[model samples]
Target: GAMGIPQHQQKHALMAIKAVKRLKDARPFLQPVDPVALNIPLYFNFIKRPMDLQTIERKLNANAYETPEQITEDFNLMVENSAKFNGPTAVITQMGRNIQAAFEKHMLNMPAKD
Candidate 1:
């Protein structure tokens, strides 16, 4: 059921030059100490499937399609839940400390700053 041939058209020399310039400009400012770069060799390894087909297949295969009544019951249960934390201050302090440790481990050895 395919309609046409997928032709690979090579661009002009000027287009290639422009692409290289853009890549150089977009290089990462900070390099990690334990750098681990990943790549995929096959084009089909990360195929983007249609959302409707994927969602329908997942729901049918899992056998967990909910009726309207079940959806309403879940919503009501969520509404009755109480506050989980005392305030935003404690949460912000903890998150800030975690971020500081990560930055010291990764960005401290970088060549230059942005």
Candidate 2:
């Protein structure tokens, strides 16, 4: 009331908080720690990654027994690559779901191996 602003107008922080709430929802499986925290690092990593997707994907790959963890890691790269290369809606669809084809879908396999 003493801030000399409108009585019922929304504060910018309210929208930001709601946006962060959506960020938290984006990856509920992350567990324990706040999922919103992921976007912070993922933001930088997303920008830094696509330029070197070839190298990073190689390191993240498995020779065999494509575990969920491996697939999840790959998906993360795919998302990062998607953002940096094309828009967020893009994918490695060059080969008909290429990322999934090039990679093993996690839910179809064993739990992610640490």
Candidate 3:
């Protein structure tokens, strides 16, 4: 709204985003990482900035995403952080890749334009 992006386009972006979140690979990143609880103190050490599906959801709810690319950036940030912290060969890292792919697929098909 603040950016003057049409409400209809925003709705389309929301649909595409929801589709990506429904993927099985998205389960692990649905919430923020709890380094202490997960016994990975190095998580924060490795990832100075963190992002997650829930965080993205809140941004969407607030109409904070001004463009499709902004949405892409936050989602990519979430996966990239995982890939870096867990290493490329880790299962979660692979899952993050899958989630990232799913996101791109939906984003490509979305009706919203930049």
Candidate 4:
């Protein structure tokens, strides 16, 4: 079934996505990783499930996500995957964390019990 998230909750989800886009550290995470194009085959070895901001937006647009929490899950996974692949001390890892923090802050700003 292609059940979609309610429009009211989707509004908040899209708003949170826009918040992440404004972050300086959000550039790298804005699109999906191209391991072959970037010549980093090992990326998949570490990141079994890759996710990106653009993908989240695409899914939301298509009504593929069943709930707002699913959006949060994908966004968090995108950041965690980067941290795991880039290593904790890597600059990209910090960038992912920063973007994640900003996203979470905005998501929390949404109405309670949505």
Clashing pairs in 2: 69-112
CA-only RMSD, every prediction: 21.0, 19.6, 1.9, 2.0
Clashing residue pairs in all predictions, respectively, total: 0, 1, 0, 0
lDDT of 3 by residue, 8-94 (tens): 666766776677678888888989999988899878778988999888877877878878788889888988898798878789989
lDDT of 4 by residue, 1-114 (tens): 547876766777888888888888998888899998878889988988999989998888788888667888998788788778887878987998888888888777666544
Per-candidate local distance difference test? 0.25, 0.34, 0.80, 0.83
Q: Any idea how many clashes model 4 has?
A: 0
In candidate 1, stretches whose alpha carbon ends up further than 4 angstroms from where it belongs are 1-89, 112-114
The sequence of per-residue lDDT tens digits that candidate 1 reaches over residues 1-114 is 122111110112122223322432212211211123523233123222211112322332343333322222322222111011212344423443333243333322333211
Q: Which residues of candidate 3, in runs, are more than 4 Å off?
A: none
lDDT of 2 by residue, 1-114 (tens): 232222121222123223322432323212222226544445444345332233323333323213334434644554555455445554322321343332343234332222
Could you tell me every candidate's TM-score relative to the true structure? 0.20, 0.29, 0.87, 0.87
* Candidate 1 positional error at 32, Å: 26
Model 2 stretches with alpha carbons more than 4 Å out:
1-46, 51-57, 60-71, 90-98, 101-107, 111-114
Identify the runs in model 4 with alpha carbons over 4 angstroms from their true place. 112-114
- Which pairs of residues have clashing backbones in candidate 3? none
